[PDB]
């Protein structure tokens, strides 16, 4: 079978098929209903490079030294020889490996000395929906230079990363969207959210167009497709953080031989996609691989999933998470750091951060919304996600949950030792200072293009954000 | 031919005891004033280092010589126009050797030269101990070894009273007793910062006493005339960089040979008048191009007005001009849409009261007078009756009872700009503006991280830092 990994950016379970109001996602809904829809799939981290380094190797990024977003780009650090890329396994089974889709990035926090792919095509701005992915160089090279070989293709879209784009074919009514309780119920929040869902509608159209191309090529009879987000949506407490908003992603498995109308509620981590793919194409998974096979007779159930947060751009941190089907455990190794520690990306791109800072100063946030704006953090957080799906009622200090807290604390310690978590080793001063310098130059370049002061007050910034949203179309 | 000293203090308003300032102890500067001529109406032509100093070293407004942007023309082949001489070129012509002395070994010119500004030299500020021995440093040692047969012109630059302010633990000032202008909040943060400013004045007063004892022992004082003056007004939020009297009005004392004691002068003097007056004292004619007036002696020429300007200040772009007679201040903001509180890294990094006022403004706690600086835009014209409004907080420009005075001063500014061919009316290049905007906004992010602070820190969080900073300073 050919294998496709169709990777969406920065998206939570916000498709219509997952129960989300107002959004129109017919093509992804149809793929889900025609195959298996997963309700408990989790990335191992909540930004691009660490989620993607992980799922392309079947290993948590912390196990392979890739835990800092970004790092090891040009310093002679190579993936350890025992750790193979997905494409090395597929090459062994006779596959040709293709990098397709507008996002021609691997986002690895390491170099390699063999190519990750055999052929490739080449704030983001999303390209028109009428893209013809199969007429670009990766696919053209495949069909012309390779005969009788199955393909493994990673197809990366830029949606739904910011900047969000309007969908004037089916515009979304901001007053009707469902907002998590940890953002303010406010016009700014809802307009930004409406554009997020309209960006999902835009990529949904693109997925429909891809499948039209694939059917026309005649490859849909012997192709299995994994569709999944790299991590959760680009909203303030979701992306970069280890709550369900940052970790839980759509995951659909589809193709001839995959029975339709299945819904799966078992724990899956994105590092499971590689071993499951190997198993699907007849390969044994090496013992070193941390991911589990989640489909077929060889599946291995999980008791837990795990995730990490280490440096993110210039913002240093050290956070770990353990989740079973019911409980989320989070450990902040640096409790003295605020959650809202300076991050240029969040301040530059997220109108709701300005909104919440403005409202926090005026004492207008709800109790649940204000938790993110405390000056420091509890060392441990424990959430009963059955009774508290938005993870705003920390149970870690409630002695009635202490046995559960200690179980999960102990599991995190066991896991860190078994995987030799490399995020426990500080980065060098030269590296941290480099990225401090990098994101000061980026911040100021971007704030300059807007004519705003680097020290702009939240209320003045909101004037800008209202105009920005109006120009986006909401 | 008498020796000439220009003793230049940094960033200081009329805040000496002899000018009527409570609590501060300035016995040495007081005595110098009382032993000579004290000037009550001396004004810089700009309110930051390079533009005021480029001006007083040439007798020309900085705008007349292309030096109006602080800083600029450091390394681009821009030279002082050949008709414009530096003070030291005139003094060289009269047989003087020119000495650059004091801890601040800088000229701060917004232009290059092809002739040295001085003949001998020694070599956030941190102020050196009061026991400094300026005559034991290389400028004076060179003078006495190589040129003792010539009269000297010396510019002696102190670092006080620029920030960071330094505590004076020998005569500590009680913050609860200092006199604060009405446009800053009567608040502990304001008063602690202000007490340290006044203790920094006390520190430089001690140094000035030590300098005069050393000059006396050197045997040169009998044949020396000394001009003591600030380069512009005090390093407080609405004073330095701005064209209110807090930014422009400076101590000025003339003392020594031929200078009769116990004289007080209430006439308009601009710092560009110091050079022509010095030329006249040493027996030179002043060329007609010089914009400064001789203010002392038989050739004195009275002023009707003084003038000042504000153009780019570090990264902050602006265009402001001022005209002042003895009574009225006129200020024209050429870019009224810009707020007064346009981002300036220096003010945000160095001024605790900026964080205090931003915090208080957000809580609606500033008085009406204090809130004027925090408006989102400016009136194109400001007019103040300084006799009745010495803090310049009651703008009369929209009061038709003062329109004749407004139009008189408006017209004088236009006349002056046309007569002097004001170069600040010509935009700087994009390459220059972008260079400095980057340079300083980088500096802001850098120093904020070094203090462990976010560049977007709230004013109230910044005030937690500023309290600890003041405590570490000693107040
Ligand atoms: Ca992503
Ligand atoms: Ca100065």
Coordinates of N, CA and C in Angstrom, one line a residue, chain A residues 11-161:
Chain A
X11 N -4.0 22.7 15.0 CA -5.4 22.5 15.0 C -5.8 21.5 16.1
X12 N -6.9 21.8 16.8 CA -7.4 21.0 17.9 C -8.6 20.2 17.3
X13 N -9.4 19.6 18.2 CA -10.6 18.8 17.7 C -11.7 19.7 17.3
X14 N -11.4 20.6 16.3 CA -12.4 21.6 16.0 C -13.0 21.4 14.6
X15 N -13.1 20.2 14.2 CA -13.8 19.9 12.9 C -15.3 19.6 13.2
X16 N -16.1 19.8 12.2 CA -17.5 19.5 12.4 C -17.8 18.1 13.0
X17 N -17.1 17.1 12.4 CA -17.3 15.7 12.8 C -16.9 15.5 14.3
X18 N -16.1 16.4 14.9 CA -15.8 16.2 16.3 C -16.8 16.9 17.2
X19 N -17.9 17.5 16.6 CA -18.9 18.1 17.4 C -18.8 19.7 17.4
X20 N -18.0 20.3 16.6 CA -17.7 21.7 16.7 C -18.8 22.5 16.0
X21 N -19.5 23.4 16.7 CA -20.6 24.2 16.0 C -20.0 25.1 14.9
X22 N -20.9 25.4 13.9 CA -20.7 26.4 12.8 C -19.7 26.1 11.8
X23 N -18.6 25.4 12.1 CA -17.6 25.2 11.1 C -18.0 24.2 10.0
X24 N -17.7 24.4 8.8 CA -18.0 23.5 7.7 C -16.8 22.8 7.3
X25 N -16.7 21.5 7.6 CA -15.5 20.7 7.2 C -16.0 19.4 6.5
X26 N -16.7 19.5 5.3 CA -17.3 18.3 4.7 C -16.3 17.2 4.3
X27 N -15.1 17.7 3.8 CA -14.2 16.7 3.3 C -13.5 15.9 4.4
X28 N -13.1 16.6 5.4 CA -12.5 15.9 6.6 C -13.6 15.1 7.3
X29 N -14.8 15.6 7.4 CA -15.9 14.8 8.0 C -16.0 13.5 7.3
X30 N -16.1 13.6 5.9 CA -16.3 12.4 5.1 C -15.1 11.4 5.3
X31 N -13.9 11.9 5.3 CA -12.8 11.0 5.5 C -12.9 10.3 6.9
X32 N -13.2 11.0 7.9 CA -13.4 10.4 9.2 C -14.5 9.4 9.2
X33 N -15.7 9.7 8.7 CA -16.8 8.8 8.7 C -16.5 7.5 7.8
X34 N -15.7 7.7 6.8 CA -15.3 6.6 5.9 C -14.2 5.8 6.5
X35 N -13.6 6.2 7.6 CA -12.5 5.4 8.1 C -12.7 5.3 9.6
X36 N -11.5 5.5 10.3 CA -11.5 5.5 11.8 C -11.2 6.9 12.3
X37 N -12.0 7.4 13.2 CA -11.8 8.7 13.8 C -11.3 8.5 15.3
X38 N -10.2 9.1 15.6 CA -9.6 9.0 16.9 C -9.9 10.3 17.8
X39 N -10.5 10.0 19.0 CA -10.8 11.1 19.9 C -9.8 11.3 20.9
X40 N -8.7 10.5 21.0 CA -7.7 10.6 22.1 C -6.3 10.5 21.5
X41 N -6.1 11.3 20.4 CA -4.7 11.4 19.9 C -4.0 12.6 20.4
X42 N -2.8 12.5 20.7 CA -2.0 13.5 21.4 C -0.6 13.7 20.8
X43 N -0.2 14.9 20.5 CA 1.2 15.2 20.2 C 2.0 15.0 21.4
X44 N 3.3 14.9 21.2 CA 4.2 14.8 22.4 C 4.8 16.2 22.8
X45 N 4.4 17.2 22.0 CA 4.8 18.6 22.4 C 3.8 19.5 21.6
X46 N 3.9 20.8 21.9 CA 2.9 21.7 21.4 C 3.4 22.8 20.5
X47 N 4.6 22.6 19.9 CA 5.0 23.5 18.7 C 5.6 22.6 17.6
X48 N 5.8 23.2 16.5 CA 6.1 22.5 15.2 C 7.3 21.5 15.4
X49 N 8.5 22.0 15.7 CA 9.7 21.3 15.5 C 9.7 20.1 16.5
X50 N 9.3 20.3 17.7 CA 9.3 19.2 18.7 C 8.3 18.1 18.4
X51 N 7.1 18.5 18.0 CA 6.1 17.6 17.6 C 6.5 16.8 16.4
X52 N 7.1 17.5 15.4 CA 7.5 16.9 14.1 C 8.7 16.0 14.2
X53 N 9.7 16.5 14.9 CA 10.9 15.7 15.2 C 10.5 14.4 15.8
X54 N 9.5 14.4 16.7 CA 9.0 13.2 17.3 C 8.3 12.3 16.4
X55 N 7.3 12.9 15.6 CA 6.5 11.9 14.9 C 7.2 11.3 13.7
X56 N 8.2 12.0 13.3 CA 9.0 11.4 12.1 C 10.0 10.4 12.6
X57 N 10.2 10.2 13.9 CA 11.1 9.2 14.4 C 10.4 8.2 15.4
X58 N 9.2 8.4 15.8 CA 8.6 7.5 16.7 C 9.2 7.6 18.1
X59 N 9.9 8.7 18.4 CA 10.5 9.0 19.7 C 10.1 10.3 20.2
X60 N 10.0 10.5 21.6 CA 9.8 11.8 22.1 C 11.0 12.7 21.8
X61 N 10.8 14.0 21.5 CA 11.9 14.8 21.1 C 13.0 14.8 22.2
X62 N 12.6 14.7 23.5 CA 13.5 14.7 24.6 C 14.4 13.5 24.6
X63 N 13.9 12.4 24.0 CA 14.8 11.2 24.0 C 15.9 11.3 23.0
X64 N 15.8 12.2 22.0 CA 16.7 12.2 20.9 C 17.4 13.6 20.9
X65 N 17.3 14.4 21.9 CA 18.0 15.7 22.0 C 17.4 16.8 21.2
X66 N 16.2 16.6 20.7 CA 15.5 17.5 19.8 C 14.5 18.4 20.5
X67 N 14.6 18.5 21.9 CA 13.5 19.0 22.7 C 13.3 20.6 22.7
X68 N 14.4 21.3 22.2 CA 14.3 22.8 22.3 C 14.0 23.3 20.9
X69 N 12.9 24.1 20.8 CA 12.3 24.7 19.6 C 12.9 26.1 19.4
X70 N 13.7 26.4 18.4 CA 14.5 25.4 17.6 C 15.9 25.2 18.1
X71 N 16.5 24.1 17.6 CA 17.9 23.9 18.1 C 18.6 23.0 17.1
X72 N 19.9 22.9 17.2 CA 20.7 21.9 16.5 C 20.6 22.0 15.0
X73 N 20.4 23.3 14.5 CA 20.1 23.5 13.1 C 21.4 23.3 12.3
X74 N 22.5 23.8 12.8 CA 23.8 23.9 12.0 C 25.0 23.7 12.9
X75 N 25.0 22.8 13.9 CA 26.1 22.6 14.8 C 26.7 21.2 14.8
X76 N 26.5 20.4 13.7 CA 27.1 19.1 13.7 C 26.4 18.1 14.6
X77 N 25.2 18.4 15.1 CA 24.4 17.4 15.9 C 23.6 16.6 14.9
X78 N 23.8 15.3 14.8 CA 23.1 14.5 13.9 C 22.2 13.5 14.8
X79 N 21.1 13.1 14.2 CA 20.3 12.1 14.9 C 21.2 10.9 15.2
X80 N 21.2 10.4 16.5 CA 22.0 9.3 16.8 C 21.8 8.1 15.9
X81 N 22.8 7.4 15.6 CA 22.8 6.4 14.5 C 21.8 5.3 14.7
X82 N 21.5 5.0 16.0 CA 20.5 4.0 16.3 C 19.0 4.5 16.0
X83 N 18.8 5.8 15.8 CA 17.5 6.3 15.6 C 17.3 6.6 14.1
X84 N 16.4 5.8 13.5 CA 16.2 6.0 12.1 C 15.0 6.9 11.8
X85 N 15.1 7.7 10.7 CA 13.9 8.4 10.3 C 12.9 7.5 9.7
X86 N 11.6 7.9 9.7 CA 10.5 7.1 9.1 C 10.9 6.7 7.7
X87 N 11.5 7.6 6.9 CA 11.8 7.3 5.5 C 12.9 6.3 5.3
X88 N 13.8 6.2 6.3 CA 14.8 5.1 6.2 C 14.1 3.7 6.3
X89 N 13.2 3.6 7.2 CA 12.4 2.3 7.2 C 11.6 2.1 5.9
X90 N 11.0 3.1 5.4 CA 10.2 3.0 4.2 C 11.1 2.6 3.0
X91 N 12.2 3.3 2.9 CA 13.2 2.9 1.8 C 13.6 1.4 1.9
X92 N 13.7 0.9 3.2 CA 14.0 -0.5 3.3 C 12.9 -1.4 2.8
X93 N 11.7 -0.9 2.9 CA 10.6 -1.7 2.4 C 10.3 -1.4 0.9
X94 N 11.2 -0.7 0.2 CA 11.1 -0.4 -1.2 C 10.3 0.8 -1.6
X95 N 9.9 1.7 -0.6 CA 9.2 2.9 -0.9 C 10.0 4.1 -1.4
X96 N 9.4 4.9 -2.2 CA 10.0 6.2 -2.5 C 9.4 7.3 -1.6
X97 N 10.2 8.1 -1.0 CA 9.7 9.1 0.0 C 9.5 10.5 -0.6
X98 N 8.3 11.0 -0.5 CA 8.0 12.3 -1.1 C 7.6 13.3 -0.1
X99 N 8.1 14.6 -0.2 CA 7.7 15.7 0.6 C 6.9 16.6 -0.2
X100 N 5.6 16.7 0.1 CA 4.6 17.4 -0.7 C 3.8 18.4 0.2
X101 N 3.0 19.2 -0.5 CA 2.2 20.2 0.2 C 3.0 21.5 0.2
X102 N 2.2 22.6 0.5 CA 2.9 23.9 0.5 C 4.0 24.1 1.5
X103 N 3.9 23.4 2.7 CA 4.9 23.6 3.7 C 6.0 22.7 3.5
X104 N 7.1 23.1 2.8 CA 8.2 22.3 2.4 C 9.3 22.3 3.5
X105 N 8.8 22.1 4.8 CA 9.7 22.1 5.9 C 9.7 20.8 6.6
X106 N 10.8 20.4 7.2 CA 10.8 19.3 8.1 C 10.8 19.7 9.5
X107 N 11.3 20.8 9.8 CA 11.3 21.4 11.2 C 12.0 20.5 12.2
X108 N 13.0 19.7 11.8 CA 13.8 18.9 12.7 C 14.7 19.7 13.5
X109 N 14.9 19.3 14.8 CA 15.9 19.9 15.7 C 17.1 19.1 15.7
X110 N 17.6 18.8 14.5 CA 18.9 18.0 14.3 C 19.1 18.0 12.8
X111 N 20.4 17.7 12.4 CA 20.7 17.5 11.0 C 20.7 16.0 10.7
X112 N 20.8 15.7 9.4 CA 21.0 14.3 9.0 C 22.0 14.3 7.9
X113 N 22.6 13.1 7.7 CA 23.6 12.9 6.7 C 23.0 12.1 5.6
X114 N 21.8 11.6 5.6 CA 21.0 11.2 4.5 C 19.7 12.0 4.4
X115 N 19.2 12.1 3.2 CA 18.0 12.9 2.9 C 16.8 12.4 3.6
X116 N 16.0 13.2 4.2 CA 14.8 12.8 4.8 C 13.8 12.3 3.7
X117 N 13.8 12.9 2.6 CA 12.9 12.5 1.5 C 13.7 12.3 0.2
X118 N 13.2 11.5 -0.7 CA 13.8 11.2 -2.0 C 13.4 12.3 -3.0
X119 N 12.3 12.9 -2.9 CA 11.9 14.0 -3.8 C 11.1 15.0 -3.0
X120 N 11.2 16.2 -3.4 CA 10.4 17.3 -2.7 C 10.0 18.3 -3.7
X121 N 9.1 19.2 -3.4 CA 8.7 20.3 -4.3 C 9.7 21.4 -4.4
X122 N 10.3 21.7 -3.2 CA 11.1 22.9 -3.2 C 12.1 22.9 -2.0
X123 N 4.6 34.5 10.8 CA 3.3 34.6 10.3 C 3.2 34.1 8.8
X124 N 2.5 33.0 8.5 CA 2.4 32.6 7.2 C 1.2 33.2 6.5
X125 N 1.2 33.2 5.2 CA 0.1 33.6 4.3 C -0.3 32.4 3.5
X126 N -1.6 32.0 3.6 CA -2.0 30.8 3.1 C -2.3 30.9 1.6
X127 N -1.9 30.0 0.8 CA -2.0 30.0 -0.7 C -3.4 29.7 -1.1
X128 N -3.8 30.0 -2.3 CA -5.2 29.8 -2.8 C -5.6 28.3 -2.7
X129 N -6.9 28.1 -2.6 CA -7.4 26.7 -2.4 C -7.2 25.9 -3.7
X130 N -7.0 26.5 -4.9 CA -6.9 25.8 -6.2 C -5.5 25.3 -6.4
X131 N -4.7 25.1 -5.4 CA -3.4 24.4 -5.6 C -3.5 23.1 -6.2
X132 N -2.5 22.7 -7.1 CA -2.5 21.5 -7.8 C -1.2 20.7 -7.3
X133 N -1.3 20.0 -6.2 CA -0.2 19.5 -5.5 C 0.5 18.4 -6.4
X134 N -0.3 17.6 -7.1 CA 0.4 16.6 -7.9 C 1.1 17.1 -9.1
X135 N 0.9 18.3 -9.5 CA 1.7 18.9 -10.6 C 3.0 19.5 -10.2
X136 N 3.3 19.5 -9.0 CA 4.6 20.0 -8.4 C 5.7 19.0 -8.5
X137 N 7.0 19.4 -8.2 CA 8.1 18.5 -8.6 C 8.2 17.2 -7.8
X138 N 7.8 17.1 -6.6 CA 7.9 15.8 -5.9 C 7.1 14.7 -6.6
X139 N 5.8 15.0 -6.8 CA 5.0 13.9 -7.5 C 5.4 13.7 -8.9
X140 N 5.7 14.8 -9.6 CA 6.2 14.6 -11.0 C 7.5 13.7 -11.1
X141 N 8.4 13.9 -10.1 CA 9.6 13.1 -10.1 C 9.3 11.6 -9.8
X142 N 8.3 11.4 -8.9 CA 7.9 10.0 -8.5 C 7.4 9.3 -9.8
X143 N 6.4 9.8 -10.5 CA 5.8 9.1 -11.5 C 6.7 8.9 -12.7
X144 N 7.6 9.8 -12.9 CA 8.5 9.8 -14.1 C 9.8 9.0 -13.9
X145 N 10.4 9.1 -12.7 CA 11.7 8.4 -12.5 C 11.6 7.1 -11.7
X146 N 10.4 6.8 -11.1 CA 10.3 5.6 -10.3 C 9.1 4.8 -10.8
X147 N 9.3 3.5 -11.2 CA 8.3 2.6 -11.7 C 8.2 1.5 -10.7
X148 N 6.9 1.1 -10.5 CA 6.7 -0.1 -9.7 C 7.1 0.0 -8.3
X149 N 7.2 1.2 -7.7 CA 7.5 1.4 -6.3 C 6.4 2.1 -5.6
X150 N 5.9 1.7 -4.5 CA 4.9 2.4 -3.7 C 5.6 3.7 -3.2
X151 N 4.7 4.7 -2.8 CA 5.2 5.9 -2.3 C 4.8 6.1 -0.8
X152 N 5.6 6.7 -0.1 CA 5.3 7.3 1.2 C 5.4 8.8 1.0
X153 N 4.3 9.5 1.2 CA 4.3 11.0 1.1 C 3.8 11.6 2.4
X154 N 4.6 12.6 2.9 CA 4.2 13.5 3.9 C 3.7 14.8 3.1
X155 N 2.4 15.1 3.3 CA 1.8 16.3 2.7 C 1.5 17.3 3.7
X156 N 2.2 18.4 3.8 CA 2.1 19.4 4.8 C 1.4 20.6 4.3
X157 N 0.3 20.9 5.0 CA -0.4 22.2 4.7 C 0.1 23.3 5.7
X158 N -0.2 24.6 5.3 CA 0.2 25.7 6.1 C -0.9 26.0 7.1
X159 N -2.2 25.8 6.7 CA -3.3 25.9 7.6 C -3.2 24.8 8.7
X160 N -3.5 25.1 9.9 CA -4.1 26.4 10.3 C -3.3 27.3 11.2
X161 N -2.0 27.4 10.8 CA -1.1 28.4 11.5 C -1.6 29.8 11.2

